């Protein structure tokens, strides 16, 4: 029996001519409750490894384990020769006004393991923060 951390739905729109990757953070489902009340205040950070310079962040959603983000971010200067060596990371956090934001889990997508020409949605299970 594997730990259940929820799942994330995203989609990607890669522009091969301009070398630009648009990432759509659509929604998360079945997140665990991080707070005493059994709920969370989720948000997502998005970045590309090994760059880890551009770190996009979604708005913070309040008191929900099934947030619908519908946010889009565009990475630039990622021509085809460059993007396939990178790994896209979604890191999901529980916001807290005062304390450190606890990481719930993460989704790692090696860019060489998918079809960059696909624009339809994908669900991925969250794995452990590490």
DSSP 55-116: -EEPPPP-S-SS-EEEEEEEE-S--HHHHTT-EEEEEEEE--SSSPPEEEEEEEEETTSS-T
Closest CA to 105 of 117, 118, 94: 94
Distance CA 15, CA 125 (A): 26
Measured CA to CA in angstroms, residue 90 lies from 18, 37, 98, 121 at distances of 23, 25, 23, 15
Query: What residues have CB less than 8 Å from 24, skipping those under 6 apart?
Result: 10, 11, 12, 13, 70, 71, 72
Closest CA to 4 of 33, 41, 38, 40: 33
* Burial tier of 117 (Cβ tally within 10 Å: 0-12, 13-18, 19+): exposed
Method: X-ray
- DSSP β-ladder status, 122-125 and 68-75: unpaired
Distance CA 69, CA 26 (A): 5
Q: How many residues does the chain have?
A: 130
Measured CA to CA in angstroms, residue 64 lies from 59, 61, 70 at distances of 13, 7, 15
């Amino acid at each position: 029996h594997m730990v259940k951390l929820g799942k994330l739905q995203y989609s990607m729109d890669y522009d091969f001519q301009k070398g630009e990757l648009t990432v759509n953070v659509i929604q998360a489902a079945d997140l665990p409750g991080m707070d005493m009340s059994g709920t969370s205040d989720p948000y997502v950070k998005v970045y590309l490894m090994p760059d880890k310079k551009k770190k996009f962040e979604t708005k913070v959603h309040r008191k929900t384990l099934n947030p619908v983000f519908n946010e889009s971010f565009t990475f630039k200067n990622v021509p085809y020769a460059d993007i396939t060596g990178k790994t896209l990371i979604f890191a999901i956090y529980d916001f807290d006004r005062f304390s450190k934001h606890d990481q719930i889990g993460q989704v790692q997508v090696p860019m060489n393991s998918i079809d960059l020409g696909s624009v339809v949605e994908e669900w991925r299970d969250l794995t452990s923060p590490d």
